[PDB]
Design a protein around this nucleic acid. Sequence first.
DNA 1: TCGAGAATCCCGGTGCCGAGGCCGCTCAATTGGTCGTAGACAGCTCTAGCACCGCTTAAACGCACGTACGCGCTGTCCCCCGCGTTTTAACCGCCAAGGGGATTACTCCCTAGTCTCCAGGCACGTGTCAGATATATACATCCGAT
DNA 2: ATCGGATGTATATATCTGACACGTGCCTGGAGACTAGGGAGTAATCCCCTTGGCGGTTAAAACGCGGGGGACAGCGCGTACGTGCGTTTAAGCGGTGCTAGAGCTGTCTACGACCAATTGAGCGGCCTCGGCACCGGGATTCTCGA
Lengths: 96, 96, 105, 104, 78, 82, 94, 93, 69, 69
Amino acid sequence: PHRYRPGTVALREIRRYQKSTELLIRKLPFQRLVREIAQDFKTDLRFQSSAVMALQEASEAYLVALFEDTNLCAIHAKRVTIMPKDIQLARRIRGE
Amino acid sequence: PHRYRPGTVALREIRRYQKSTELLIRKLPFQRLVREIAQDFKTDLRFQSSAVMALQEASEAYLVALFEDTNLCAIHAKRVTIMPKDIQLARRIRGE
Amino acid sequence: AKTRSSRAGLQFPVGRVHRLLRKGNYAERVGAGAPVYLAAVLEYLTAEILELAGNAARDNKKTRIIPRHLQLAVRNDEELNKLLGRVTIAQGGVLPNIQSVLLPK
Amino acid sequence: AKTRSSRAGLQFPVGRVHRLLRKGNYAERVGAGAPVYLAAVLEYLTAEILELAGNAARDNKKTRIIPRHLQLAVRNDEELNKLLGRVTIAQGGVLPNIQSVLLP
Amino acid sequence: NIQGITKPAIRRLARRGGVKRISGLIYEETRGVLKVFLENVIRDAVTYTEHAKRKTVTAMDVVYALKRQGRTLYGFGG
Amino acid sequence: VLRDNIQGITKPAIRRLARRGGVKRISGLIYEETRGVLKVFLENVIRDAVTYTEHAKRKTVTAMDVVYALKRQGRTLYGFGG
Amino acid sequence: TRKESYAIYVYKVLKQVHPDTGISSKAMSIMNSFVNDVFERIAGEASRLAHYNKRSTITSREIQTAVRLLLPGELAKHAVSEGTKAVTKYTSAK
Amino acid sequence: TRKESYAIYVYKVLKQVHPDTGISSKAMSIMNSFVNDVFERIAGEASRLAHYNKRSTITSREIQTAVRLLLPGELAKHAVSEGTKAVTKYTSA
Amino acid sequence: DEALVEELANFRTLVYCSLCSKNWKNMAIKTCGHVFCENCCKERLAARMRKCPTCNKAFSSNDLLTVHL
Amino acid sequence: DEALVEELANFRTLVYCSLCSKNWKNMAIKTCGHVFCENCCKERLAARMRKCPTCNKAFSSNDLLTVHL
DNA sequence: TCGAGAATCCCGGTGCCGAGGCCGCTCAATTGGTCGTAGACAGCTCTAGCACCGCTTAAACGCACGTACGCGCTGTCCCCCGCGTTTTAACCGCCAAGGGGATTACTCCCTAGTCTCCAGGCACGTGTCAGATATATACATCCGAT
DNA sequence: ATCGGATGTATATATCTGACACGTGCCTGGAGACTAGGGAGTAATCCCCTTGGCGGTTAAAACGCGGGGGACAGCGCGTACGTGCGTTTAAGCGGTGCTAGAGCTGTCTACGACCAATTGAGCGGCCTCGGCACCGGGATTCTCGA
Ligand SMILES: [Zn+2]
Ligand SMILES: [Zn+2]
Ligand SMILES: [Zn+2]
Ligand SMILES: [Zn+2]
């Protein structure tokens, strides 16, 4: 039949997601995660919708900004695959 | 003709210089540099001795803290020698 | 009776800025011509970005600015990008960029 | 006539803190019990760091506190290092360590 | 719980970032990184919402907690 | 006037800082690269001290203007009267 | 009750540069929150300058030297040149 | 003229933890700057935090929560307790 | 002659950038079609002046197109 | 003096269309930066001459831009 | 080299709900005086920043030589990408109940403000001893021959 | 792996000075006592918005298999950098001299806080239609095995 070489679909979907603008993570599981994390500080809390939306936006921005820094130090070792050691080095250099 | 292996002497200077606390650049050559730089913003300016000393006390810390992080990028790429392409990456990851 | 903004030939309000400076615990006294200097700076910075965003709002064959067009205005110029260096604009996205090593030969 | 700090039981001055807080353009009014609370926190942190500095000086057979001991005590403790993150101490130095791979 | 952040969702973020090949151990690493950041923001949000004797954490508390951490966010007021 | 004083930062002086940093081997093309990084860090700090020292109508840089300039960039320094 | 914003002034500024161009609610809400952020920084920096020199009034000079401390590079020249031209017009007016 | 400092108070505290040591003049300036920085950035958070709630006075409650937002982890749990234990004594007398 | 020089002078104004009068016209703007040299144009873009010196129409960096001869 | 006669001819051939030598260079190509006259441009599109002469490439309808002077 | 196949773009038509203008109405910015303190200006004192010279002598500098390391090449193999089928729960539309956020009266007590009084923190002076410097001695360490 | 020679790093005792610790005079800032008024604590209420539950589509997630490209390990070579030695240069230290500028003091005048009366600008509520969202059809371009 018909197949594609490994990489072309990756490049086209890269080109695809760097031109759109909506949220990437599903909303209901993220809301459940936030409600579960907040339980260990003060029980019986309530959330506005805007608070959850702001939390999601900030998390997306942080993760996107970190995945594009780990890639830059993955290339430095003459390699084309990101690794946990690359993530750890990026986080260490940034100054966490 | 009693020589040493290439690196056993450089491995001792690290221990020597990580235990003492003193300035490492020559005072008069460093002081002339500040006066040369600071004659473009405003001419015929004067300095206190403490101003020059405090300006020198910070560059030491900056350079030392920068040379610590460029030594991790060289280790990441399976090397011991630090090349100019490590200073660029370390400075670019923290945003400057 | 004219207004102070009209007398100073501006677009932004000077009286509101004068009141905001006073009711903010910044200093015991506020000079006369401080708001007329501070309001002329807040307007130039706004006019710069609203002019740089209208070109992006036109290159996409649109006629109404949206946050995506503001995202591409403060990231394609060093002067504004260095001022808004730690700001995350909601519904902004990213800037199209691919590393040169990843492309095929 | 008793001092305002002896009533609380502190060593730091309460009146000086009160007048510094009432004249730095922070708020229009300052509560009575605010300087007493603030002067008791400033005293704890200084003792916390000055005990570690004293121990570090004692381990070096000295009997004073030069700036190196301050840097050692600050950099050896996690919470203090995190609090004093982006601050440099003059004539401080550096914490001795060598990368494990570099040794033979 | 933390298993709602699925592998395709994680990989779409990497695609937006600009990577082309992903090792199989990345997802477990990134979940534990996100879980740390969320705690740091939420603790300050809860302190802000508790100082005012309220029972609902609002958007402005999240905005302030983000602002004091060196990460300001436009688009939600203030 | 005085010129080309950037060559006062000598090779042994640069290498002594790297020794304290912790490195073991140094490449040849590091000194020129490093001399261009210190010459940029000293413009940002000084351009603020000069701004401070002329708003007060003085014509001599003090030891407090440098501390204020270093504090304005998130590099607070203890020990000089800050 | 009442709530105040720069949404009416930003729109007036926009119609001087681009005669025929609208702006959506989210873009307006972002442009509104940017001005407050800049205003809170300039005045906040100008207050410390007054405190340092043992003064008590925020006059036009502190604003000028605080603009020259925050805006990077070439923007500061234009900002100062635009402020010092409005002030002189104001002072010699009716 | 004169100028104020925390020298006497820092020395008084030092002679309580270690009764037989001293301190040099160069480290004294560092200790004097540290207490000016911490007090400056603790009381700068209370004024801003009271502005959010449309208040006008900074009381002990505005500082008890301003300490919790700066000191990390274990340090805050001790600072809050020691600050609270001091106000009770003062109020009683 | 003068007429021979005048045509030489007349054509000289057409080849050189009017702002610089030292380099051949190299840079053109898509919005208005006017052609100047690359060097004089870039320094204007760093001076925050986005209005054409001739037709006053606003422009941006992407609207810059090189020309040959 | 032939010294400045050659310059004028060099100036003349620079501004005149190298094809017809009768019209100014007022129609440039967006794809590769060459400039010719509008007279010699649309005659080529009659036979669909998308290949440029100088560098010999194809083009389109939006690759022709009006230029002045 | 280029044809088959799949993904992507240009165009036309239809519809809907949010931007843009309009109107009435509080309340905040504007005029107009009055007064009292912050600050601009002139003068005086004195100190500390700059310029120059002579004398060690520590360190920067240039050169020879050897070798450990960076870089390019080749080979095996295993793990991540592409694609198809099946199972899940996210999303949308709808409904209902009650909690607490925001608003309005009412009171009362806690902080600013003024005057009086005096002891504590600061500038200045002085003894003396902790540590820096030099020197002889014990030892851990390293590179070579075996 | 096992000794041995040489080198640099601790270890122990004078000596000697300049900075730390302590004491005294004196003045200004902190402690007492009383007054008035406005910020803040408390009670009631009402209505928006958050939580909880239900049913249908279907879009996205989960699972399995084939194979081909990329990660990694082992080898070999040659240039660049570390180590040591002799020669040269400028830094560091001391001492003297002179004057430009910081820091403090006394005048007094112009400028900003404060209060009573007006009025028009900016905000809340309502309508409306056109720009943008969406769907269905061709036309062009991009990739891969020949
Ligand atoms: Zn030109
Ligand atoms: Zn033009
Ligand atoms: Zn022609
Ligand atoms: Zn061509």
